[PDB]
């Protein structure tokens, strides 16, 4: 039972590569992405689990500052506990 | 860090327009929708962030009463904090 | 307002049937599944609401032990309250 912060980013489809690049540079182990609708126009949704709150805010602050003046989008955070995940918890395990 | 209520509605694909219409009339700023499976048959999932609990229940109570006697579906709620989002937090920001 | 445990499983696409079969045998009422990306390669995401914590861990422990030595994936849990859902709450309702 390793606690975690689930960061969610919903925004326009064009930024996929731009946001994916930012997530990799933050220190996050991995992420999930999926095609969605919004209002209905096609857009994307990122889901990133992070060990610390600070890392989650670091990802949100950069994406918002860089693109949210021009492009539409929303970013929010949820509490979670990771039970299994080699990259997130390590070979040691989530215990 | 503006607190929010994440309302989730999973139900049959036919109701997309019917449920989308209800969400707009509730006072919710926007929503996300996506194609999913369930048991596997194709169905839809709505995700709505709301400022108050009452608004979330207002959306759930109407959709359930109107369609859940006939159609299959589930509605649940999650705690969240919106970090960035112009429509949800306003030009003032989520602070 | 019936409390629930939202179990989420993200893993490789091949295991869809293998994991779907396990979820059915656990005692979970139903589930949601959807095509997603991850890092970008195509993969799947399961979402299972469960009445007890023990049932959620039972599903996670079996899937992890059986496939997570070979295949990549992450499993985490979120708090939630089910407002409407005939299969989850019964004909009595979520109250």
HSE-CB for B11 with a 13 A CA cutoff: 28
PDB experimental method: X-ray
Q: Do A76 and B4 touch (CB under 8 A)?
A: yes
Please choose, from the candidates C87, C83, C1, the residue with its C-alpha nearest in 3D space to the C-alpha of residue B60: C83
Beta strands in B1-95 (DSSP E): 2-12, 32-38, 41-50, 73-85
Q: Do A84 and C72 touch (CB under 8 A)?
A: no
Q: Helices H, strands E: what count in chain A?
A: 3, 4
- Nearest by CB: B76 against C33, C82, C86: C82
CA–CA separation, A54 and B70 (whole Å): 46
Residues of C in contact with B39 (CB under 8 A): 20, 24, 30-31, 33
Dihedrals phi, psi of B91, to nearest 5 degrees: -60, -30
The structural domain count of chain B equals 1
CATH of the domain at A36: 3.30.70.120
Distances (CA, A) of C15 to A34, C7, C52, C64: 18, 17, 25, 12
DSSP-H helix ranges across C2-71: 16-26, 53-67
Q: Do C80 and B75 touch (CB under 8 A)?
A: no
Residue A85, helix vs strand vs coil: strand
CA–CA separation, B54 and B59 (whole Å): 9
CA trace torsion C56, C58, C60, C63 (10° rounding): -140
CA–CA separation, C81 and B65 (whole Å): 18
Kindly identify which residue of chain A lies nearest to residue B89, measuring between CA atoms: A74
Could you give the angle at the alpha carbon of B50 between the alpha carbons of B44 and B53, nearest 5°?
A: 110
Residues of A in contact with B33 (CB under 8 A): 36-38, 40
Question: In this structure, what DSSP letter does residue B27 have?
Answer: T
CA–CA separation, B59 and B51 (whole Å): 13
Dmax (CA) for chain A in angstroms is: 44
Burial class of residue A1 (count of CB atoms within 10 Å of its CB; 0-12, 13-18, 19+):
exposed
**Residue range of the domain that includes B52:** 1-95
Q: What was the resolution (in A) of this experimentally determined structure?
A: 2.2
| 2-41 in chain B: CB under 8 A from chain C | 10, 34-40
- Nearest by CB: A84 against C37, C45, C75: C75
Distance of CA A46 to the CA centre of its chain: 5
CA–CA separation, C90 and B29 (whole Å): 32
Q: Do B36 and C34 touch (CB under 8 A)?
A: yes
CA–CA separation, B82 and B93 (whole Å): 10
Would an 8 Å CB–CB cutoff place B83 in contact with chain A? yes
Chains in touch with B (3+ beta-carbon pairs under 8 Å) read A, C
């Amino acid at each position: 039972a390793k606690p975690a912060n689930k960061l969610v980013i919903v925004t326009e489809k064009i930024l996929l590569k731009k946001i994916a690049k930012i997530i990799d540079e933050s220190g996050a182990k991995g992420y999930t992405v999926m095609n969605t609708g919004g209002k209905i126009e096609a857009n994307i949704k990122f889901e990133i689990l992070t060990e610390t709150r600070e890392m989650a805010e670091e990802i949100a602050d950069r994406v918002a500052v860089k693109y949210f003046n021009d492009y539409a989008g929303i970013i929010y955070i949820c509490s979670a506990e990771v039970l299994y995940g080699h990259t997130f918890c390590g070979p040691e395990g989530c215990s």
